[PDB]
Structures are given as structure tokens and as C-alpha cells.
Amino acid sequence: NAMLTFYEYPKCSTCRRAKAELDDLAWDYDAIDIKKNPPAASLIRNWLENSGLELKKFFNTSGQSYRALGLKDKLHQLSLDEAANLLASDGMLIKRPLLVKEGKIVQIGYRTAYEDLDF
Ligand code: NA
């Protein structure tokens, strides 16, 4: 089982770019469909608590689920247990792609090349 877990979705242009880079680097990874098999709530909670990243960075703010639910108004009210439950309940709510190493979040989205992580 690969040290790297790559969460993606078919209709996701950034995911396709990121996966192409993983292939070019020949890094071992396990690709998981974030809608069919989202990360567990306990795992998401650990990221929310320990990554140092702000809560909103974990949400797919350009997606329908986020808009339809008005999370814009609600996010500042959520506890991290509440947010982890929410995210775990609908993979379409979660920012993608995600790159995870041995259970630890190492990159959300694809603003910078994975090679910079220097694994
Ligand atoms: Na990523």
C-alpha cells in the first residue's frame, strides 16, 4: 500500500493535471475517488486539527454542494467535529485534489507542482 494517497474525481481538471505529474515523477500513489470513497471523518478531523490550514481550505467552495448549503454563512459557526462530519458525509464538499502521505495531509488543491514537496 502506497505511502501516497491521491483523492480525485473524474470531472476535475486540476486532478487530471496533478495525476499527470505523479505519473511523470513515477511516484507511487493510490488514487481514490473522493465522491465514491471520501476520507473518514476521524482522518479529516486530524487534518483540520493538526495541519495548521484554515478550515475553508478544506472545502470545495466553487462546488454546488457548498453553494446549495450556504456554507459561506455557516462555516465560521462550525466546530471542527461538525466540519469533519460534514466533509465526510459528501465527498463533493471536499476540496480536490488531495495528496496524503501516511495519513497526513500534504497538499490541498493544485496551486503548486507536487515535485516541490521533495519526497
Ligand atoms: Na493535492
Coordinates of C-alpha atoms and ligand atoms in Angstrom, one line a residue:
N1 CA 0.0 0.0 0.0
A2 CA 1.4 3.3 -1.3
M3 CA 2.7 6.0 1.2
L4 CA 0.8 8.5 -1.0
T5 CA -2.9 8.6 -1.3
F6 CA -4.4 10.8 -4.1
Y7 CA -8.0 11.9 -3.8
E8 CA -9.5 12.8 -7.2
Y9 CA -12.8 12.9 -9.2
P10 CA -13.4 12.3 -13.0
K11 CA -14.8 15.8 -13.7
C12 CA -11.8 17.7 -12.2
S13 CA -9.3 19.4 -14.4
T14 CA -6.9 20.1 -11.6
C15 CA -7.0 16.5 -10.6
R16 CA -6.1 15.4 -14.1
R17 CA -3.0 17.8 -14.2
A18 CA -1.9 16.6 -10.7
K19 CA -2.2 12.9 -11.6
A20 CA -0.2 13.5 -14.8
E21 CA 2.6 15.0 -12.7
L22 CA 2.5 12.0 -10.3
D23 CA 2.8 9.7 -13.3
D24 CA 5.7 11.8 -14.8
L25 CA 7.5 11.7 -11.4
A26 CA 6.9 7.9 -11.1
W27 CA 5.9 8.4 -7.5
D28 CA 3.8 5.5 -6.0
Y29 CA 0.3 6.6 -5.2
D30 CA -3.1 5.1 -4.6
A31 CA -5.8 7.0 -6.5
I32 CA -9.2 7.2 -4.6
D33 CA -12.4 8.7 -5.9
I34 CA -13.3 11.3 -3.4
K35 CA -17.1 11.1 -4.1
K36 CA -17.3 7.3 -4.0
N37 CA -14.9 6.8 -1.1
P38 CA -14.2 10.0 0.8
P39 CA -11.8 10.1 3.7
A40 CA -13.1 9.1 7.1
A41 CA -14.3 11.7 9.5
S42 CA -11.7 10.9 12.1
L43 CA -9.0 11.3 9.5
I44 CA -10.4 14.6 8.2
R45 CA -10.7 15.7 11.8
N46 CA -7.0 15.0 12.3
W47 CA -6.1 17.2 9.3
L48 CA -8.4 20.0 10.5
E49 CA -6.8 20.0 13.9
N50 CA -3.1 19.5 13.1
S51 CA -2.4 20.8 9.6
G52 CA -2.3 24.4 10.6
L53 CA -4.5 25.1 7.5
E54 CA -7.6 27.2 7.8
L55 CA -11.0 25.4 7.7
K56 CA -12.2 26.9 4.5
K57 CA -9.1 25.5 2.7
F58 CA -10.6 22.0 3.0
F59 CA -13.9 22.9 1.3
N60 CA -14.8 22.8 -2.4
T61 CA -16.0 26.4 -2.3
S62 CA -16.7 26.5 -6.1
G63 CA -18.9 23.4 -6.0
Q64 CA -22.7 23.0 -6.0
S65 CA -22.9 21.3 -2.5
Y66 CA -21.1 24.2 -0.8
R67 CA -23.3 26.8 -2.5
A68 CA -26.6 25.0 -2.1
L69 CA -25.9 24.6 1.6
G70 CA -24.8 28.2 2.2
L71 CA -21.6 27.2 3.9
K72 CA -20.3 30.7 3.3
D73 CA -22.6 31.9 6.1
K74 CA -22.3 28.8 8.3
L75 CA -18.6 27.9 8.2
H76 CA -17.4 30.3 11.0
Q77 CA -20.0 28.6 13.3
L78 CA -18.9 25.0 12.8
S79 CA -16.8 23.2 15.3
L80 CA -14.0 21.0 13.8
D81 CA -16.0 17.8 14.7
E82 CA -19.1 19.3 12.9
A83 CA -16.9 20.3 9.9
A84 CA -15.2 16.9 9.7
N85 CA -18.6 15.2 9.8
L86 CA -19.9 17.4 7.1
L87 CA -16.9 16.8 4.8
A88 CA -17.0 13.1 5.4
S89 CA -20.7 13.0 4.5
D90 CA -20.3 14.2 1.0
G91 CA -17.1 14.0 -1.0
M92 CA -18.3 16.7 -3.3
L93 CA -17.9 19.2 -0.4
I94 CA -14.2 18.4 0.0
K95 CA -11.5 20.4 -1.9
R96 CA -9.8 18.3 -4.5
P97 CA -7.3 17.0 -5.4
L98 CA -5.8 16.0 -2.0
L99 CA -2.4 14.4 -1.6
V100 CA -1.9 12.5 1.6
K101 CA 1.2 10.8 2.9
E102 CA 0.9 8.1 5.5
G103 CA -2.4 9.6 6.6
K104 CA -1.1 13.2 6.8
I105 CA -2.4 15.9 4.5
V106 CA 0.5 17.2 2.5
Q107 CA -1.2 19.2 -0.2
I108 CA -4.7 20.5 -0.8
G109 CA -5.6 21.5 -4.4
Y110 CA -3.0 22.1 -7.1
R111 CA -1.7 25.6 -6.9
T112 CA 1.9 24.5 -6.9
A113 CA 3.7 21.4 -8.5
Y114 CA 3.9 18.3 -6.4
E115 CA 7.6 18.0 -7.1
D116 CA 8.2 20.9 -4.8
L117 CA 7.2 18.7 -1.9
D118 CA 10.5 16.8 -2.4
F119 CA 9.5 13.4 -1.3
Ligands
NA1 NA -3.3 18.0 -3.9

